[PDB]
UniProtKB/TrEMBL annotation, chain C:
Subunit record text: Component of ORC, a complex composed of at least 6 subunits: ORC1, ORC2, ORC3, ORC4, ORC5 and ORC6. ORC is regulated in a cell-cycle dependent manner. It is sequentially assembled at the exit from anaphase of mitosis and disassembled as cells enter S phase. Interacts with DBF4. Interacts with POLQ.
SMART domains named among the record's database cross-references: AAA (SM00382)
Name of encoding gene: Orc4
Species in which this protein is naturally found: Drosophila melanogaster (Fruit fly)
Keywords, sorted A to Z: ATP-binding, DNA replication, DNA-binding, Metal-binding, Nucleotide-binding, Nucleus
Protein name: Origin recognition complex subunit 4
UniProtKB/TrEMBL annotation, chain D:
Subcellular location, record wording: Nucleus
Subunit organization: Component of ORC, a complex composed of at least 6 subunits: ORC1, ORC2, ORC3, ORC4, ORC5 and ORC6. ORC is regulated in a cell-cycle dependent manner. It is sequentially assembled at the exit from anaphase of mitosis and disassembled as cells enter S phase.
Stated role: Component of the origin recognition complex (ORC) that binds origins of replication. DNA-binding is ATP-dependent. The specific DNA sequences that define origins of replication have not been identified yet. ORC is required to assemble the pre-replication complex necessary to initiate DNA replication. Binds histone H3 and H4 trimethylation marks H3K9me3, H3K27me3 and H4K20me3.
Protein name in the entry: Origin recognition complex subunit 3
Family the entry assigns: Belongs to the ORC3 family.
Membrane-spanning parts: none
From TrEMBL, chain E:
Listed name of the protein: Cell division control protein
Superkingdom of origin: Eukaryota
Residues represented out of the complete protein: 557 to 660 of 662
Chain segments annotated as coiled-coil in the UniProt record: none
Subcellular localization: Nucleus
Family to which the UniProt record says this protein belongs: Belongs to the CDC6/cdc18 family.
Length: 401, 398, 441, 193, 104
């Protein structure tokens, strides 16, 4: 019966299996070189040694090796914009430390890991930490009690435990008891707990954490700066290996046009994959520069001029008249009645007749659906406020040119 | 199709084009329905009764499953889905459980069967203007319920408004708008004359008066009476129920020179203009205590007489707000007997508030602290009637 | 009779092609090939992708996904190595409801015939544990997120973060395909969700902005196709029903038209669409809305009038349905009012023209109306209560809106323009000349 | 006398779409007429012509609470003549509960509103529209407790709500008249020392 | 990055030349587009510009007051202008952008 199966699931005795394919997967020898480049340029394929993150690797490795060898416990906070190699470098450090512990060069340790965005409440961190120790799924009150009995009571031989906490800003709330508990347990001498906390903003400990939590969080911090155009090219030409599938100027264009916007590594490794997919359907074996140009135009999209050009005739007269009412009144927020007056003026100039204000309200709702304009519910006709979401110069670029 | 239209045209005169359009769209059950119909009109144009008769006739003659709602009883969406799935999946009993829109669509998808039986579903949602004041995924889902359930169904909406009051920030699907125009004078005369046989059979049951009744109560007599009735009553209302309800009583008053023995238009044109003054009242002297009367006229003088003027009047557009201290000051100014403040006077203030003769425009959480503001909610004629029954003139203090 | 039944079959065929037929599309050669190649590379090679179908409402976004899935699903290499999870932002209003639907549709070990056990956190942990334990040997999951902008409104975007995070991890090969109508849905995402999203965005702006493409579409939507094309489409629909919309589809195999009937109907349709009146009506519709849903609404209203007494489509019928489409409806509500409400609306228009759209009241409009009614000699005997009930009839029909106080003293706004009232004065039947003279001044 | 007229009104509706309703022009003093309504329920339960729910103004702050107390009052009333949780008190359960018992027999469903002026206006209008929507299926009679005058009824009921209303006015005696009757027949009676 | 440099320079220019410091995202994007079109660099649309300002918010230079629509989000500079001049370290570009009042 499924209820016994769920009681086995909460006990952790039955593996959460997933369905298997009926057909065997494709072999590596059948793949083309463009296909090998497209599967090496994936963002899920992490390298064993990350390029251009050697100094941060040395910093986190020296920190965690020192806290393991001294058997003391403490805390760390690494930060940076997304895509900058934080979680990959931290898990690479911990994989290197576990390889050292399996070769008896380091004392053995436990590695628990949670994520702030994989939880439905911040209180479920107690459930997910305790699940990775025993396997049992319990309530968060009993899990909190068992974790406090584990960490606050001295019991030789306690093994060192390393708790990585991704997305620390989600574990914060108003009361801040979960983050206080996770950063307060290293302060006790009975707990050999080393906490690494990953978040995005650099000033998270002073912005939204309290004073005692910022005191416990320490000052041993690391920042992951965004990738420059040299580093973000080195990453992609490391992923390609020794292959000659990509031109040298194409990767330089990808790095120069991604590093100027965000410094994300996922953005570059997705634009190069899209360029490979463009070069595949063009029946060529190399990814030249115009394939990268088409991929850069597709991924970094700007499709509001295409929407205004493909609007209907009455929609374009309405879009001209909202900008005319903005120019006339000066303010950016216009009521529907002045817009309809300018609509009838522009339609009288253009030689067309316009629909009545009901179908004009339908046009306003249709443009507000595309978010070309911002408009209210149509229950307040003739007095609803109409913001112009597109700029007024894009309308004149689309309807003249 | 033609059986439904041939059945509905007797009961609904002057609506042949609307019945014909609804028979074009959702008449036959074998042909596919449009995703939604929105018929609208004024009050009394017959959109609840026509869709009820259409849904009953379709469920009688064909394989359709109908569901007529009212959006006022559906204060949350679970009520609407429970009525909808009770009607569209009948004989489910007390085992029916609907949680949300997803479970409603998932249980409606199971109702699909083979195409040999030609089944359909029809949903009429009366008073559809309430759907925009609820959970904001009800009206977008109901306009595409045929696409979601992959089933031959139509969602009819009934309101007094155009569909241009219904567009929201997210956009809506296509709808087939239909108009029920209100009748002119000739169509309303035909509707009022369609029950001439029911009128004659009611009057023949209610003995010289019966033999003078049946010799002339005929078609042209009732048509001329309805002509004289609509000559004075069509100016104020075109509502067919109010005109029927007033025409019955005015016929009961009009028959008397014919029963007892032009030449009738004046004798009814008296009572016709007496009964015109009580249109929209559907009917088939406020005594108060003495200090309640003084407190009520003091509240009227406080709400009317421009509180800067109270220095000149008492020391010896909208109704203005006043505090309880100003009301008691005007009470002690106009009383001229100086009764002491007790429990019963301020209790009379509170029970005049509870009788809706006064009201609380502001405050109402701090009635005792002096920051509460009241306003009087009566007219001058009632105040003058109170001043007549008291002996205190108000127009000197006005 | 036999000639009466062939028109019944033609009307049923055209109605079923207009409302149903969720699979076949017209146009979109590059975008459909993009989506088809993306889902094929997800299902075959085990790649994890993400996509964002974008476009206006009414363009064929759902029809494109139905076409791509109906072309891929009878392959039995797609259909046996891939399970598909459909989610809707209107139906799955929370991450709890969406997650229980994901747990049911993937047939997980705690599903047990549509009744998921455990809390929301247990369902999330079991789903992430199931997807993390898989790999290239596992079945591909294809998530389809319709109304994708409403999934961004959920708390903390946990479902969007977890569906995009599996696409960037060494886990089960999933594909996240969002479909939404907003063109700037990517600024609704949080920066982590925006970082994990692969920014490929397919736009579906409709390719019938030119009027001749609109006329060609209206011709192809009314013509009767050849029997060989009907046989090919019926074979495709039978292969789709052999393996969701497939239960009640078009199924064009039940309809069979003789070649004389097809040639006569297509000749009459081309002859009508060559005229100037039908092209003027379609020009009015194309000037309003170039979407295919608007044209299909027009053609459904036109096909439904094919009674056996009038078997042909003609340009005057198209002109009648276009005149039905083009009219104002608040003018039709204004002509249904009695003369008392019309005099009240004339007094409201007079007050609004004098005081430059200032707010009015029942007392102000009753004063301005009583100044007319004493000298009108048709409105002398009206009580105050009847005019108040007429004011309430104007208020509940939303020709008067409040500024959102007693019922006779609330301030209001006129919801009409002056042109609508001026056209109502011309279209009104049996309006007395006293009111028509008071309306001009 | 007014009791007999109200019972004849309810029975004459039982002998027989707008709901029939009965405005009772009672006095200023609201605590005095709860005994009048209790006697009306006792006379309606004596003939078994109807079953009565009394909707106080304190129970009807919203439309949800008004419909819930209405269905709960009618269900518990018929339960007490010969229990559902209040969140399960819907109009569909009232229809099924009426179809189970009294469709085989026609028992009216009298709804007293003793303090008509204290009710919320919008909740009252929606309640009257709901009770008017269920006519034919469920027989509803709506006796009222209007205290001031009929102008309050004609003012708080708009154009659309009053069109579904078939009211008939009754008049209770004035409070000084009842005082003079008590003062002449009790406090001046010779039998009391 | 270059686009965050151009965003910060237009925010400093808009705060220097205007005494109303209630800057919306669309009003900032309109000045950013003209500054980019003056230097003949292709400007981002509103959808990438919102993510760019969101990435500058993480450094602590800004604080974005959230509203109902992403066009109406209010940017609030939380550094003084000399810290921005020292942090951008591209004074040849900063002095070129601050002297161009005409694109506002
Ligand atoms: N220096 C690098 N060399 C090679 N690949 C990299 C490098 N940095 C990042 N990547 C790739 O980019 C992806 C970045 O994901 P990662 O877990 O590093 O995000 P993050 O930096 O932790 O930020 P966030 O989790 O906030 O998005 C990884 O899948 C990794 O394969
Ligand atoms: N054309 C007609 N012929 C005969 N009777 C009619 C006609 N139109 C309406 N009626 C009668 O009028 C009565 C009330 O009409 P109905 O309640 O359908 O109007 P409604 O549009 O529902 O009003 P509301 O908008 O207030 O809900 C019905 O009993 C119906 O029989
Ligand atoms: N390219 C096309 N090919 C075939 N049919 C189309 C096309 N574009 C629009 N349609 C028709 O227009 C209507 C639009 O429906 P569809 O579901 O495809 O659009 P949608 O964008 O998903 O709508 P929504 O966003 O409101 O769900 C359908 O009836 C469809 O048949
Ligand atoms: Mg991470
Ligand atoms: Mg109705
Ligand atoms: Mg769709």
């Amino acid at each position: 019966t499924p209820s016994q199966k769920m009681k086995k699931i909460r006990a952790g005795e039955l593996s959460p299996s997933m369905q298997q394919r009926t057909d065997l997967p494709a072999k590596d020898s059948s793949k083309s070189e463009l296909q090998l480049a497209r599967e090496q340029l994936h963002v899920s394929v992490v390298p064993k040694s990350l390029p251009c993150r050697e100094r941060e690797f040395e910093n986190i490795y020296a920190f965690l090796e020192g806290k393991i060898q001294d058997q003391c416990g403490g805390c760390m906070y690494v930060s940076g914009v997304p895509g900058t190699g934080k979680t990959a470098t931290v898990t690479g450090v911990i994989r290197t430390l576990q390889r050292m512990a399996k070769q008896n060069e380091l004392p053995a340790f436990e590695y628990l890991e949670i994520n702030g965005m994989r939880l439905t409440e911040p209180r479920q961190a107690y459930v997910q930490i305790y699940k990775q120790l025993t396997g049992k799924t319990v309530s968060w009150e009993q899990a909190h009690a068992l974790l406090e009995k584990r960490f606050t009571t001295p019991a030789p031989r306690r093994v060192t435990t390393v708790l990585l906490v991704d997305e620390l800003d989600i574990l914060c709330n108003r009361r801040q008891d979960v983050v206080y508990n996770l950063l307060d347990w290293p302060t006790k001498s009975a707990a050999k707990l080393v906490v690494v906390t990953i978040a995005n903003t650099m000033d998270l400990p002073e912005r939204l954490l309290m004073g005692k939590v910022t005191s416990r969080l320490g000052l041993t911090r690391l920042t992951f700066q965004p990738y420059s155009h040299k580093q973000l090219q080195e990453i992609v030409t490391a992923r390609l290996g020794g292959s000659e599938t990509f031109k040298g100027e194409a990767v330089q264009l990808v790095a120069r046009k991604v590093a100027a916007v965000s410094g994300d590594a996922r953005r570059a490794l997705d634009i190069c994959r899209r360029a490979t997919e463009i070069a595949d359907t063009a029946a060529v074996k190399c990814v030249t520069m115009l394939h990268v140009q088409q991929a850069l135009a597709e991924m970094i999209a700007s499709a509001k001029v295409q929407a205004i050009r493909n609007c209907s005739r009455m929609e374009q007269i309405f879009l001209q008249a909202i900008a005319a009412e903005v120019t006339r009144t000066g303010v950016e927020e216009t009521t529907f009645m002045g817009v309809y007056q300018q609509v009838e003026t522009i339609a009288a100039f253009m030689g067309v007749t316009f629909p009545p204000p009901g179908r004009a309200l339908r046009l306003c709702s249709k443009l507000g659906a595309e978010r070309l304009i911002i408009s209210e519910h149509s229950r307040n006709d003739l007095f609803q406020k109409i913001l112009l979401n597109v700029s007024a110069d894009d309308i004149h670029y689309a309807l003249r040119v | 199709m033609e059986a439904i239209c041939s059945s509905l045209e007797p009961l609904f005169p002057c609506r042949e084009a609307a019945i014909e359009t609804l028979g074009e769209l959702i008449g036959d059950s074998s042909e596919t329905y449009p995703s939604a119909i929105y018929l609208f009109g004024h009050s009394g144009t017959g959109k609840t009764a026509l869709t009820r008769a259409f849904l009953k006739e379709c469920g009688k003659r064909q394989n359709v499953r109908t569901a007529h709602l009212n959006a006022i009883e559906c204060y949350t969406t679970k009520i609407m889905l429970e009525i909808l799935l009770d009607s569209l999946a009948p004989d489910q009993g007390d085992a029916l459980k609907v949680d949300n829109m997803l479970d409603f669509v998932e249980q409606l998808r199971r109702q699909a069967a083979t195409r040999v039986e030609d089944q359909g579903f029809l949903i009429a949602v009366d008073n559809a203007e309430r759907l925009r004041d609820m959970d904001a995924n009800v009206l977008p889902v109901l306009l595409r319920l045929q696409e979601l359930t992959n089933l031959n169904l139509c969602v009819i909406l009934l309101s007094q408004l155009p569909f241009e009051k219904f567009y929201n920030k997210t956009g809506l699907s296509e709808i087939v708008c239909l108009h029920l125009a209100q009748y002119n004078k000739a169509e309303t005369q035909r509707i009022l004359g369609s029950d001439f046989q029911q009128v004659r059979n009611q009057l023949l049951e209610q003995k010289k008066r019966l033999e003078i009744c049946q010799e002339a109560v005929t078609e042209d007599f009732y048509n001329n009476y309805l002509n004289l009735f609509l000559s004075v009553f069509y100016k104020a209302c075109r509502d067919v129920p109010e005109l029927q309800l007033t025409a019955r009583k005015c016929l009961s008053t009009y028959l008397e020179p014919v029963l007892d023995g032009s030449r009738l238009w004046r004798h009814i044109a008296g009572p016709l203009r007496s009964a015109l003054t009580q249109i929209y009242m559907r009917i088939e002297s406020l005594e108060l205590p003495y200090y309640a009367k003084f407190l009520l006229i003091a509240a009227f003088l406080a709400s009317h007489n421009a509180a800067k003027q109270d220095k000149r009047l008492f020391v010896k557009l909208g109704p203005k707000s006043f505090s309880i201290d100003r009301l008691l000051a005007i009470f002690y100014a106009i009383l001229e007997e100086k009764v002491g403040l007790t429990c019963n006077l301020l209790s009379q203030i509170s029970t005049l508030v509870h009788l809706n003769l006064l009201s609380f425009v502001s405050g109402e959480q701090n009635i005792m602290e002096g920051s509460a503001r009241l306003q009087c909610t009566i007219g001058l004629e009632f105040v003058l009637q109170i001043g007549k029954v008291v002996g205190f003139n108000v127009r000197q203090y006005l | 009779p036999e000639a009466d039944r062939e028109l019944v079959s033609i009307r049923r065929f055209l109605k079923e092609r207009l409302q149903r037929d969720y699979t076949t599309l017209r146009g979109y050669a590059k975008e459909r090939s993009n989506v088809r190649l993306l889902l094929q590379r997800t299902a075959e090679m085990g790649e994890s992708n993400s996509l964002l179908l974008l476009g206006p409402r009414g363009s064929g976004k759902t029809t494109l996904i139905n076409s791509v899935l109906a072309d891929l699903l009878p392959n039995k290499s797609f259909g046996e190595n891939t399970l598909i999870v459909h989610l809707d932002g209107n139906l799955h209003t929370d991450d709890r409801v969406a997650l229980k639907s994901i747990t049911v549709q993937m047939q997980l070990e705690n599903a047990a015939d549509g009744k998921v056990f455990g809390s929301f956190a247990e369902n999330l942990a079991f789903l992430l544990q199931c997807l993390k334990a898989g790999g290239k040997h596992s079945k591909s999951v294809i998530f389809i997120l319709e109304e994708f902008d409403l999934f961004c409104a959920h708390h903390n975007q946990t479902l969007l973060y977890n569906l995009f995070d599996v696409s960037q991890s060494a886990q089960a090969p999933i594909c996240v395909l969002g479909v939404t109508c907003r063109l700037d849905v990517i600024e609704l995402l949080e920066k982590r969700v925006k970082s994990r999203f692969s920014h490929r965005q397919v736009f579906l702006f409709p390719s019938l902005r030119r009027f001749e493409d609109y006329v060609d579409l209206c011709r192809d939507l009314l013509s009767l196709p050849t029997g060989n094309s009907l046989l090919l489409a019926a074979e495709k629909i039978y292969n789709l029903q052999n393996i969701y919309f497939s239960r009640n589809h078009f199924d064009p195999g039940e309809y069979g038209f003789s070649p004389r009937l097809r040639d006569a109907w297509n000749k009459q349709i081309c002859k009508v669409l060559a005229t100037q009146q039908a092209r003027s009506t379609l020009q009015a519709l194309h000037d309003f809305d170039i979407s295919e849903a608007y044209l299909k609404n027009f053609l459904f209203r036109l096909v439904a009038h094919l009674r056996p007494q009038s078997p042909h489509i003609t340009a005057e019928k198209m002109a009648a349905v276009g005149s039905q489409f083009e009219g104002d409806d608040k003018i039709e509500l204004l002509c249904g009012l009695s003369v008392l409400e019309l005099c009240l609306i004339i007094a409201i228009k007079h007050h609004s023209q004098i005081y430059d759209r200032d707010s009015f009241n029942f007392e102000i409009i009753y004063a301005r109306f009583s100044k007319f009614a004493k000298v009108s000699t048709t409105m002398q005997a009206v009580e105050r209560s009847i005019v108040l009930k007429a004011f309430e009839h104007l208020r509940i029909a939303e020709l008067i809106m409040p500024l959102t106080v007693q019922k006779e003293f609330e301030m209001h706004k006129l919801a009409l323009t002056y042109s609508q009232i001026h056209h109502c004065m011309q279209r009104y039947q049996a309006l007395p000349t006293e009111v028509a003279q008071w309306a001009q001044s | 006398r007014t009791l007999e007229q109200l019972v004849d009104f309810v029975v004459g509706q039982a002998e027989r779409e707008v709901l029939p309703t009965a405005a009772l022009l009672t006095g200023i003093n609201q605590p005095d007429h709860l005994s009048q309504f209790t006697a009306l329920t006792q006379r309606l339960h004596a003939q078994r012509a109807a079953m009565v729910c009394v909707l106080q103004s304190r129970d009807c702050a919203t439309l949800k609470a008004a419909v819930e107390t209405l269905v709960f009052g009618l269900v518990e009333d018929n339960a007490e003549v010969e229990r559902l949780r209040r969140s399960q008190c819907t109009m569909k359960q009232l229809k099924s509960w009426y179809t189970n018992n009294f469709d085989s027999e026609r028992r009216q469903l009298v709804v007293i509103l003793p303090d008509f002026e204290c009710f919320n206006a919008s909740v009252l209008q929606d309640l009257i529209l709901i009770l008017s929507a269920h006519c034919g299926s469920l027989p509803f009679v709506l006796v009222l407790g209007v205290a001031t005058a009929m102008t309050a009824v004609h003012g708080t009921l708009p154009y659309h709500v009053s069109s579904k209303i078939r009211l008939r006015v009754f008049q209770t005696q004035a409070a000084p008249t009842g005082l003079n009757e008590v003062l002449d027949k009790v406090l001046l009676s010779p039998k009391y020392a | 990055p270059l686009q965050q440099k151009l965003m910060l320079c237009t925010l400093v220019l808009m705060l220097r030349n205007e005494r109303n410091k209630d800057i919306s995202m669309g009003r900032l994007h309109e000045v950013y587009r003209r500054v980019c079109a003056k230097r003949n660099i292709l400007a981002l649309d509103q959808a990438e510009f919102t993510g760019t300002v969101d990435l500058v918010e993480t450094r602590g230079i800004l604080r974005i007051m959230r509203k109902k629509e992403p066009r109406l989000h209010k940017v609030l500079l939380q550094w003084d202008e000399e810290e921005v001049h020292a942090a951008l370290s591209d004074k040849q570009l900063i002095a070129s952008i601050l002297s161009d009042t005409a694109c506002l």
